[PDB]
Structure 1
């Protein structure tokens, strides 16, 4: 079975975002951690990084996430960055990933 539902859903949501042409606020979330990476395509480049992994914090993976989102805003807004669009990758906008997003205001936003 070639090219799984994961990587279709992946690609589908990604390309739609990439067309609007904002910077990309891209979300990886593993079983353990949740990472978030703000990217400018066409320079093929990451600008503002934020992990739970590098902020070494724990318990309630969601409340961890609102935090790595507030982490990104504070970090990012400091470079001038305000408007972006939310990548959300192959993940339902829900729970942990919704939480990192609604934590990614105080800066950033419309999300």
Structure 2
């Protein structure tokens, strides 16, 4: 109970204290995956990442990197101009490393 749930509530509360204003919530797994943006629980939630517009379920952590960069610019302008970070159900090397670089260009803008 408290165990895995905590895996969760932990990345949670820590992430939370963190405060540079916004955080995107990526989400691991295939069709599962998708990342939405949030700030202070003001109540609001900027823009939504990638509606399952499938591009290559293949060996594509790139299906990923793509949906990512996508969301990257999506928000980039979606919501004028800002800076912060996000969640992640894991380290940045696969699926998540991916949403990362996606965001990465999102800000990089080149």
TM range (shorter): 0.7 to 0.9
> TM-score under structure 2 normalisation?
0.72
Query: Does the CA contact (< 8 Å) of 2:70 and 2:106 recur in 1?
Result: no
Secondary structure at the aligned position of 1:97 is classed as helix
Distance 1:53 1:18 in 2: 31
Deviation, 1:18, is: 4.2
Query: Does the CA contact (< 8 Å) of 1:13 and 1:90 recur in 2?
Result: no
Deviation, 1:21, is: 3.8
Deviation, 1:7, is: 2.8
> How many equivalent residue pairs?
110
- From the superposition, tell whether residues 9 and 80 of structure 1 become closer, same or farther in structure 2 (CA, over 3 Å): closer
- From the superposition, tell whether residues 17 and 98 of structure 1 become closer, same or farther in structure 2 (CA, over 3 Å): farther
> TM-score under structure 1 normalisation?
0.72
Distance 1:77 1:110 in 2: 8
Deviation, 1:92, is: 2.2
Distance 1:81 1:92 in 2: 29
Query: Does the CA contact (< 8 Å) of 1:69 and 1:104 recur in 2?
Result: yes
Structure (1 or 2) with the greater helix fraction: 2
Structure 1 segments unaligned to the other structure (5+ residues):
none
Structure (1 or 2) with the greater strand fraction: 1
Query: Does the CA contact (< 8 Å) of 1:23 and 1:84 recur in 2?
Result: yes
Query: Does the CA contact (< 8 Å) of 1:7 and 1:90 recur in 2?
Result: no
